[PDB]
Amino acid sequence: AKVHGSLARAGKVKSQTPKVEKTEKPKKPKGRAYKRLLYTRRFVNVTLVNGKRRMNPGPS
Amino acid sequence: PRAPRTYSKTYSTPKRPYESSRLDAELKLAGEFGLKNKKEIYRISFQLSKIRRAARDLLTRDEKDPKRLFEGNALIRRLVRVGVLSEDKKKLDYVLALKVEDFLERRLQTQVYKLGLAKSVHHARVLITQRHIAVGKQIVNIPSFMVRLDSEKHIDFAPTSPFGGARPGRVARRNAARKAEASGE
Amino acid sequence: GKGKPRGLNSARKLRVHRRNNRWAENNYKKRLLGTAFKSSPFGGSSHAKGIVLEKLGIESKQPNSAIRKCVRVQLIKNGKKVTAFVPNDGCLNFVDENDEVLLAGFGRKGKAKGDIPGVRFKVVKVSGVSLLALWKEKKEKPRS
Amino acid sequence: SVGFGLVYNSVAEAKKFEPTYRLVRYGLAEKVEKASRQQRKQKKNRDKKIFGTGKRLAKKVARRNAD
RNA sequence: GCCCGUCGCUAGUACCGAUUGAAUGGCUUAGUGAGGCCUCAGGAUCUGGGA
RNA sequence: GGACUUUUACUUUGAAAAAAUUAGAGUGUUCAAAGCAGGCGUAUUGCUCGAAUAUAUUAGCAUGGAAUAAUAGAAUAGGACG
RNA sequence: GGAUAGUGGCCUACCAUGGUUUCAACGGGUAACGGGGAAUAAGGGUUCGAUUCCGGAGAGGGAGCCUGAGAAACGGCUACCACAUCCAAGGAAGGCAGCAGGCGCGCAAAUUACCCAAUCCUAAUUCAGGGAGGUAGUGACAAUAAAUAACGAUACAGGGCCCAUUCGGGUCUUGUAAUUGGAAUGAGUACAAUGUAAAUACCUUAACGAGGAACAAUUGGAGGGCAAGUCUGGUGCCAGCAGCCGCGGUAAUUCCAGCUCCAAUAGCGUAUAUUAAAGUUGUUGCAGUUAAAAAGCUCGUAGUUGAACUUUGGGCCCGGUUGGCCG
Ligand SMILES: [Mg+2]
Ligand SMILES: [Mg+2]
Ligand SMILES: [Mg+2]
Ligand SMILES: [Mg+2]
Ligand SMILES: [Mg+2]
Ligand SMILES: [Mg+2]
Ligand SMILES: [Mg+2]
Ligand SMILES: [Mg+2]
Ligand SMILES: [Mg+2]
Ligand SMILES: [Mg+2]
Ligand SMILES: [Mg+2]
Ligand SMILES: [Mg+2]
Ligand SMILES: [Mg+2]
Ligand SMILES: [Mg+2]
Ligand SMILES: [Mg+2]
Ligand SMILES: [Mg+2]
Ligand SMILES: [Mg+2]
Ligand SMILES: [Mg+2]
Ligand SMILES: [Mg+2]
Ligand SMILES: [Mg+2]
Ligand SMILES: [Mg+2]
Ligand SMILES: [Mg+2]
Ligand SMILES: [Mg+2]
Ligand SMILES: [Mg+2]
Ligand SMILES: [Mg+2]
Ligand SMILES: [Mg+2]
Ligand SMILES: [Mg+2]
Ligand SMILES: [Mg+2]
Ligand SMILES: [Mg+2]
Ligand SMILES: [Mg+2]
Ligand SMILES: [Mg+2]
Ligand SMILES: [Mg+2]
Ligand SMILES: [Mg+2]
Ligand SMILES: [Mg+2]
Ligand SMILES: [Mg+2]
Ligand SMILES: [Mg+2]
Ligand SMILES: [Mg+2]
Ligand SMILES: [Mg+2]
Ligand SMILES: [Mg+2]
Ligand SMILES: [Mg+2]
Ligand SMILES: [Mg+2]
């Protein structure tokens, strides 16, 4: 159908979302130590069991 | 015009990419044996798979068939050699059984921990890859060395590094140089 | 027994017969006609590089409403003229007419993507650099 | 460290049966050095264009400088 | 509710088609025919019938 | 050595058989991908195990089989044995 | 008969009318060198092989030939065609699908380096020559091993556990911690010796070389398929996303971001092709009343297919290889 529609707005929403700079955080261990940190997180000490289990909850 | 340098890969990847259960399963293993990769688990189950294959293909040949007896014995005597296969189950319907942790339970990584000497599967790694501990006088820095049973009695720190005498080495020797240089003259 | 001759010498019938019906397979026919090499904008090859003629504003298909921002490209090895998609927010700002671009497929075995009608390709690079990097900021567009 | 060793019955038998780079390593042979292997190639090839001695071609060219 | 076709707009693909249209490649009629090879001659010269 | 022999298919074992690749034995390249090494003493005058096996089909060759499936035979007897 | 090294329509005379074909001749196509083989893993298959070994063909295209034991040779010659270089304009010269290197072409591919030390080749030959070949450089083609951290103490918090009339912490550690603590090691840097033809790296190893400002892991994804949020801010059928289904028109679980989270991790996305899934090519193994599909009907050649029946039954001997009960 129509092919010469406007082009004015190309790059609109990216160029109007307010920047927020990344936040500086602890550096995560690479390799083994990470698989390690997961194991203890995922299994060893556990966290919750609300109903079952959740992995990225926020306000609950 | 030269002979091909031959090679092969040593690992294989899960058909299903995201099986929640196999994933939990895998991560635990890593956590138990101080692995860094899911590949290090892939590698082994791949070794296991082919072993199981040859074990299958053999056990369909007649009992007391030449190849079956030759290659079958050979297979078992290799497995027992490293301490994966139990002396009791020495007849390859339990090679056909077998399973991964039996293989895992035999890496240098593990043995260096299992009998004291490290008190952490991770410390176990770190130590090995840092030129401590050896098999003979021969130092080994590869965590997946796989301890050949009759080399288990000879695992100990190397005659070099600390932990086996012969120096503290630069990071401690730095502090000792800081004691007779500040306090004294 | 239905159809297929079960006989012990009927091999020749059995092969020929197959030969014939392979032609009802879309990939086998495509391969042997060489539709790849004959028709089809790209040479048979995986990507191809052309020059930008006009910046277009393709309106999407239903039930979507959008203007989809594409480029008419003239394939270098070919002269063949083709319309290609310029992905991610902006990027139509990266191109400009007469610029070189590296086109690639859309992952649909020929066949248009979603609400973009007619378009069977997508842009991957301009002036030798990559829309992607440009989009981020890891790299910059060349002099002229 | 594992290496390989030899020990000749005499030093005239070593000097003759040894690699000529080995007698060099040690100190019992001079490294008579030469032009780049490619320079020498280009030596040959220039000589290839000359039939006979050469110095005869000098004099015929000494005449050239007159004409 | 669903729904068919002409008709009208935009874009795309292929078809037919004056141009006895165009291009590349492989074989090839007829005509012309290089060059080496074989052969009939030849004889600058150079010796004992040959070179 | 002479004199003659209905043709086939199938299947068995076997010969002839490149290496590298593939399967695979032996060997602790520090592990491994590899490699085809290496291992023992008198480590001052040498001892020694290796460098396997298997697959290699269709065709051709060689041999065992005689089921399954073809073929030819004796009826104008121009038959078979002597 | 001639020709050839020699058989042969190889060629020539004479003579004849033959040779191939639905069991597919002949013709066309091939983005065709053939094999050893490669990729995919229930099996049966399907796809691929320009390319390390063997065979073949070629040297810009054709033809011709000299030498020679061997070439219809091209880093040999002659000619034509097509390119194309030098000139004093008279002429002369060239053949990278050798090694590098340049243009072009394109999605697509590295040094105008060293050496004959090895491997082997050739010559008159132990010696010379060898861009064969080896060496280094370029090199995330593939493939292997696997660093980015390890251990105590302390500050509460716990979960334990004995007791609980009730403070609770104290022992055995589960670990979340915004002060701590000394330990360890090669990434690198570098005496040295080793390496090597000479070097470079590797293996060795003196002196150096880790605390968050590193020596600081990535690549995609977080609605479903599909493992991980209904956080916060933005936009308002726009911008964009979405292999497919679908999201976006003002509280977006899909966009643009921040935070947090998942998967694989020195590697991860993407495009194209192919394979498995696919019993959606079906010999194994498909489907055809109504979903795609039985020719209106019968005859019929090729083709595939095609009932039963002929030495069976019984008796005797010989010598093996496993297995038992004893040894
Ligand atoms: Mg059809
Ligand atoms: Mg839809
Ligand atoms: Mg247009
Ligand atoms: Mg072209
Ligand atoms: Mg030279
Ligand atoms: Mg000379
Ligand atoms: Mg005309
Ligand atoms: Mg056989
Ligand atoms: Mg062998
Ligand atoms: Mg004749
Ligand atoms: Mg005729
Ligand atoms: Mg046919
Ligand atoms: Mg071709
Ligand atoms: Mg080939
Ligand atoms: Mg092929
Ligand atoms: Mg080609
Ligand atoms: Mg040739
Ligand atoms: Mg060329
Ligand atoms: Mg011709
Ligand atoms: Mg030639
Ligand atoms: Mg050349
Ligand atoms: Mg040549
Ligand atoms: Mg002149
Ligand atoms: Mg070249
Ligand atoms: Mg490349
Ligand atoms: Mg030489
Ligand atoms: Mg001499
Ligand atoms: Mg070279
Ligand atoms: Mg790092
Ligand atoms: Mg640090
Ligand atoms: Mg990220
Ligand atoms: Mg989920
Ligand atoms: Mg919102
Ligand atoms: Mg939101
Ligand atoms: Mg988000
Ligand atoms: Mg992957
Ligand atoms: Mg079958
Ligand atoms: Mg079906
Ligand atoms: Mg129907
Ligand atoms: Mg009918
Ligand atoms: Mg019958």
Side-chain angles (χ1 to χ4, degrees):
Chain A
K2 280 246 262 29
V3 162
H4 296 289
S6 183
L7 294 199
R9 300 194 283 280
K12 178 171 187 267
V13 154
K14 169 148 134 120
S15 84
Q16 57 167 354
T17 50
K19 173 123 289 282
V20 359
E21 218 111 342
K22 282 173 172 288
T23 58
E24 221 202 2
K25 74 206 69 173
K27 145 266 171 51
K28 331 161 95 87
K30 340 284 174 157
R32 212 196 66 262
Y34 190 76
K35 257 48 160 49
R36 181 202 206 164
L37 192 151
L38 269 275
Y39 178 58
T40 51
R41 244 238 264 80
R42 195 100 78 211
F43 294 141
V44 170
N45 89 317
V46 94
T47 55
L48 76 157
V49 271
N50 192 339
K52 36 198 94 168
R53 64 207 144 190
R54 291 274 208 85
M55 227 159 320
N56 189 12
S60 65
Chain B
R2 302 92 66 262
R5 209 52 170 278
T6 160
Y7 63 83
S8 323
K9 51 185 278 182
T10 58
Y11 72 113
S12 165
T13 152
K15 212 191 167 311
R16 290 166 193 268
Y18 299 117
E19 227 190 81
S20 209
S21 26
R22 170 196 47 90
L23 284 164
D24 291 324
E26 284 155 357
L27 212 194
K28 297 178 199 185
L29 282 169
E32 296 187 42
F33 301 101
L35 310 175
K36 97 151 166 186
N37 290 338
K38 228 68 109 62
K39 195 182 299 125
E40 288 196 297
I41 294 175
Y42 298 158
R43 171 173 56 194
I44 294 309
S45 43
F46 178 67
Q47 294 183 326
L48 183 269
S49 175
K50 308 204 271 202
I51 273 169
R52 280 182 38 80
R53 187 232 346 112
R56 283 180 282 209
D57 292 8
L58 284 165
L59 282 214
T60 57
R61 313 186 68 81
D62 160 44
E63 222 217 39
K64 279 243 171 178
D65 166 291
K67 192 169 181 271
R68 171 179 175 169
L69 296 161
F70 188 63
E71 306 221 354
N73 264 315
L75 178 62
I76 312 165
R77 103 98 205 174
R78 241 212 319 293
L79 293 147
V80 174
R81 237 259 222 98
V82 269
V84 179
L85 204 65
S86 34
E87 207 86 357
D88 346 89
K89 326 314 154 188
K90 195 183 287 176
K91 268 282 86 69
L92 118 147
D93 306 41
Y94 175 80
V95 310
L96 231 220
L98 228 12
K99 86 187 171 210
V100 217
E101 308 94 312
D102 306 313
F103 281 85
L104 266 14
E105 200 76 19
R106 298 300 302 167
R107 337 167 59 227
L108 217 210
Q109 163 96 83
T110 64
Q111 290 299 113
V112 144
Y113 162 82
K114 241 41 185 166
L115 186 66
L117 215 144
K119 270 175 84 296
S120 164
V121 310
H122 311 114
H123 180 94
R125 268 257 184 163
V126 173
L127 281 184
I128 310 186
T129 155
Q130 283 177 322
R131 323 280 300 291
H132 308 184
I133 118 263
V135 159
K137 79 131 273 68
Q138 177 61 81
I139 315 184
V140 178
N141 69 11
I142 299 121
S144 189
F145 169 86
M146 287 281 175
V147 170
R148 27 257 218 167
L149 204 69
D150 304 43
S151 285
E152 192 175 354
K153 298 151 310 186
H154 308 104
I155 320 169
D156 207 272
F157 301 98
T160 13
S161 100
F163 293 98
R167 218 182 212 185
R170 249 84 313 276
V171 23
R173 303 273 60 179
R174 177 249 311 278
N175 300 336
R178 271 182 192 158
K179 148 161 144 52
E181 85 103 76
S183 325
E185 309 85 5
Chain C
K2 199 136 68 49
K4 58 170 93 165
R6 221 79 135 295
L8 209 265
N9 311 343
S10 71
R12 161 175 292 125
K13 146 95 69 173
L14 285 176
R15 326 142 41 151
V16 176
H17 234 83
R18 176 93 301 120
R19 273 219 294 272
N20 290 340
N21 290 264
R22 289 294 286 284
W23 287 110
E25 289 163 59
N26 188 40
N27 310 84
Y28 166 91
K29 180 113 172 143
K30 279 334 129 50
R31 262 166 45 217
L32 278 166
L33 308 192
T35 311
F37 308 148
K38 296 199 198 130
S39 43
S40 129
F42 280 1
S45 36
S46 65
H47 303 70
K49 210 211 279 168
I51 286 183
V52 193
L53 296 192
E54 53 187 342
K55 290 152 102 126
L56 297 186
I58 313 310
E59 80 191 5
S60 73
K61 262 129 115 206
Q62 294 317 289
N64 275 26
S65 188
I67 285 172
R68 294 253 85 102
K69 322 295 189 306
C70 315
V71 284
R72 287 243 92 197
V73 180
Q74 181 168 37
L75 289 183
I76 293 192
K77 57 154 172 200
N78 245 14
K80 303 208 170 196
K81 239 128 73 177
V82 150
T83 137
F85 179 71
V86 192
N88 288 319
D89 205 355
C91 291
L92 192 61
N93 310 300
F94 281 111
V95 272
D96 305 17
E97 314 212 339
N98 277 310
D99 275 91
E100 272 170 359
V101 292
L102 208 256
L103 299 194
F106 237 165
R108 265 260 243 168
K109 230 290 206 306
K111 316 303 171 182
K113 241 277 296 318
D115 57 13
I116 342 181
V119 198
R120 292 167 279 128
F121 300 98
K122 81 189 178 212
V123 185
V124 173
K125 310 164 81 186
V126 308
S127 300
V129 302
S130 132
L131 269 290
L132 185 287
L134 280 177
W135 199 43
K136 320 233 250 217
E137 232 94 37
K138 330 173 109 288
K139 243 101 148 286
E140 215 155 298
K141 232 194 161 181
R143 349 95 177 252
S144 315
Chain D
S1 312
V2 170
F4 203 83
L6 321 173
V7 51
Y8 294 85
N9 302 337
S10 59
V11 190
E13 238 132 36
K15 251 198 187 176
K16 76 127 59 181
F17 280 130
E18 277 287 274
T20 178
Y21 77 92
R22 279 208 216 124
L23 293 173
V24 152
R25 293 196 181 200
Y26 303 154
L28 349 116
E30 196 81 316
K31 226 312 114 54
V32 47
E33 201 33 61
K34 16 75 184 308
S36 170
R37 129 159 295 241
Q38 84 159 30
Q39 289 176 238
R40 278 182 276 121
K41 289 180 192 277
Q42 306 176 335
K43 212 144 179 171
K44 172 208 60 146
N45 278 317
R46 295 188 288 263
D47 294 7
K48 281 193 70 204
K49 324 208 208 57
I50 305 306
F51 184 77
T53 314
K55 52 107 193 74
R56 204 287 203 85
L57 183 74
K59 58 133 297 171
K60 218 284 280 302
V61 118
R63 313 282 297 284
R64 196 219 190 211
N65 303 27
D67 192 90

